[PDB]
C-alpha cells in the first residue's frame, strides 16, 4: 500500500498494456484504488481508456487469483455507477465471468463476484433477468448450502442476501416464476437467521415478491412465512419492521383467504403500536394495511373491532401526517362499505364523525369523495334504524354541515352532486 495509491489513468493504462502479469496486477490494483475513493471516482475516465475488456479478461486468470480479485473489485465499482456505466461492464462480457467466480476457492473473490452481480441485477429488470439467464441462481444458492448459516462470515452472508434481494426486485416484468420458486426456500431459511441486516434484506425480498398479482402472493404464502413475518413485524429494529410491514401489507391486497392468514398469525395485535408509530412511513404503511383489511369480509371487520383498532383509526384520522390521514379515510370508507349495521354504528360511538368532518377541509379532491361515500354509508346504516336525524345534529354540531354545503358549489361533478344529495336528503 504505497506504489499503487493515486496513479494517473495513463500510468494505469501503461501497466495494463505491458506484457508483464505482475505489472498488470499492480496497475489493476491502482485502478481499483482510484475507483474506490469516495470523492468522485473517475469511472468514465476508466471506461474511456478501454480498461473494461482487460479487467474482464483478468477475471478468467485462475492462475493469478490476486488479479482476479483486483479486477473483480474494479469492475464492481464501475458497475455501481449509472445505468450507462453498468451497461459498459455488462457489454464487456462480465456477467458469465462473474458467475464463474462464484465457485472460486477464495471466499473473498467469491464474495466480490456476489457483490458485482448484485450491482448488475440492481440496475433493473432487464439486467436482473440477464443475470438469471446466464445461470447465476444455482451457484449463488450453493454458497448457502451449509448446515448452519452462522458458520459463514457475517459480511459474506449479508452480501449474498442483498444480491438475492435484487434478483427478487423490480417489476414490469416481475422476476420469472421459476426463478422465484428456486430462490424462495433459501429466502425462507434466511428469514430465520439472527442477523438484523440479513433479516431486513430477506423481508425486503419477500416484500418485492408479494407486490404483484394474487398468485405471486400465493407462492410466497404457500411457504408458510406469514407467522415469521408477523413476528418480524414486532421487532425493535425499524429497518426490519419497515420491510416486514410492507410484505404484510402486500399480502392483504390478495384474497380474503390470504388476508385471513395474516390475521390468524396474530398481526392485528401489533397494530396498536404500528398505528401510533413515531416514524411516519410506518404509520402510513400500517394504515394503508388496515384499509385493505377493512375491505375484507364482515367477520374480518369484526376481528378489527375485537382487537380495539377502531379507536386507533379514529386517532389516525384525528391527527397524523396528511398522507396517513388519507389512508385512514380509505380505511373508514372501506369499513362502512362492507360492514354490518352494528359495525357501522360502532364506528360512530367511537367518535369517527368529527375527525372525518374536519378532513373535508382538505383540498385534495380524491379524499373528499372518499369521505362523502363514508358519510353516505353511515347515514344509510342509521336510516335502517331511523337515526338519520340524530346523526344530522352530530354532523351539524361539529361544523360538518357547513363543510358539505360548501362543496355543494365545488369543482368536481362527483363532489357537488353528493354534497347536494346529502343535504337535499338528510339535512334541510
Amino acid at each position: 500500500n504505497q506504489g499503487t495509491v493515486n496513479w494517473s489513468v495513463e500510468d494505469i493504462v501503461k501497466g495494463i498494456n505491458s506484457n508483464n502479469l505482475e505489472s498488470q496486477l499492480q496497475a489493476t490494483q491502482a485502478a481499483r484504488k482510484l475507483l474506490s475513493r469516495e470523492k468522485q471516482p473517475p469511472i468514465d475516465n476508466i471506461i474511456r481508456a478501454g480498461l473494461i475488456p482487460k479487467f474482464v479478461s483478468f477475471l478468467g486468470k485462475t492462475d493469478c487469483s490476486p488479479i482476479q480479485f483486483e479486477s473483480a473489485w474494479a469492475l464492481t465499482n464501475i458497475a455501481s455507477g449509472t445505468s450507462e456505466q453498468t451497461k459498459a461492464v455488462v457489454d464487456g462480457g462480465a456477467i458469465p465471468a462473474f458467475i464463474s467466480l462464484l465457485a472460486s476457492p477464495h471466499a473473498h473473490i467469491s464474495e466480490q463476484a456476489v457483490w458485482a452481480l448484485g450491482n448488475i441485477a440492481g440496475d433493473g429488470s432487464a439486467f436482473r433477468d440477464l443475470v438469471i439467464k446466464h445461470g447465476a441462481i444455482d451457484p449463488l444458492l450453493a454458497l448457502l448450502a451449509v448446515p448452519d448459516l452462522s458458520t459463514l462470515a457475517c459480511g459474506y452472508l449479508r452480501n449474498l442476501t442483498w444480491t438475492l434481494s435484487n434478483l427478487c426486485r423490480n417489476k414490469n416484468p416481475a422476476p420469472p416464476l421459476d426463478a422465484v420458486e428456486q430462490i424462495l426456500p433459501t429466502l425462507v431459511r434466511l428469514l430465520h437467521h439472527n442477523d438484523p441486516e440479513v433479516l431486513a434484506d430477506s423481508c425486503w425480498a419477500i416484500s418485492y415478491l408479494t407486490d404483484g398479482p394474487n398468485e405471486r402472493i400465493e407462492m410466497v404464502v404457500k411457504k408458510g412465512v406469514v407467522p415469521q413475518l408477523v413476528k418480524l413485524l414486532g421487532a425493535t429494529e425499524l429497518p426490519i419492521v419497515t420491510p416486514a410491514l410492507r410484505a404484510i401489507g402486500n399480502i392483504v391486497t390478495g384474497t380474503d383467504e390470504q388476508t385471513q392468514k395474516v390475521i390468524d398469525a396474530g398481526a392485528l395485535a401489533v397494530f396498536p403500536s404500528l398505528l401510533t408509530n413515531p416514524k411516519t412511513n410506518i404509520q402510513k404503511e400500517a394504515t394503508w394495511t388496515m384499509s385493505n383489511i377493512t375491505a375484507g369480509r364482515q367477520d374480518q371487520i369484526q376481528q378489527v373491532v375485537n382487537h380495539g383498532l377502531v379507536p386507533f383509526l379514529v386517532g389516525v384520522l384525528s391527527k397524523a401526517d396528511f398522507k396517513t390521514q388519507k389512508e385512514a379515510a380509505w380505511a373508514i370508507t372501506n369499513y362502512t362499505s362492507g360492514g354490518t349495521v352494528e359495525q357501522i354504528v360502532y364506528l360512530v360511538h367511537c367518535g369517527i364523525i368529527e375527525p372525518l368532518m374536519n378532513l373535508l377541509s382538505a383540498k385534495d379532491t380524491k379524499i373528499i369523495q372518499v369521505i362523502l361515500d363514508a358519510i353516505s354509508n353511515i347515514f344509510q346504516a342509521a336510516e335502517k334504524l331511523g337515526e338519520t336525524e340524530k346523526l344530522s345534529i352530530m354532523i351539524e354540531e361539529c361544523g360538518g354541515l357547513d363543510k358539505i354545503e360548501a362543496l355543494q358549489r365545488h369543482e368536481n361533478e362527483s363532489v357537488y352532486k353528493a354534497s347536494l344529495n346529502l343535504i337535499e336528503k338528510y339535512f334541510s
Partner: peptide
C-alpha cells in the same frame, strides 16, 4: 365487488428502499 383492495404504489427503488447498487470502500 369487494375488490376495494388497493395495491401499493411505492416503487421498488429510491428513498426508504435498500440500495440498488453499492460501491466497495475497502477490504
Amino acid at each position: 365487488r369487494q375488490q376495494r383492495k388497493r395495491v401499493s404504489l411505492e416503487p421498488h427503488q429510491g428513498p426508504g428502499t435498500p440500495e440498488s447498487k453499492k460501491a466497495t470502500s475497502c477490504f
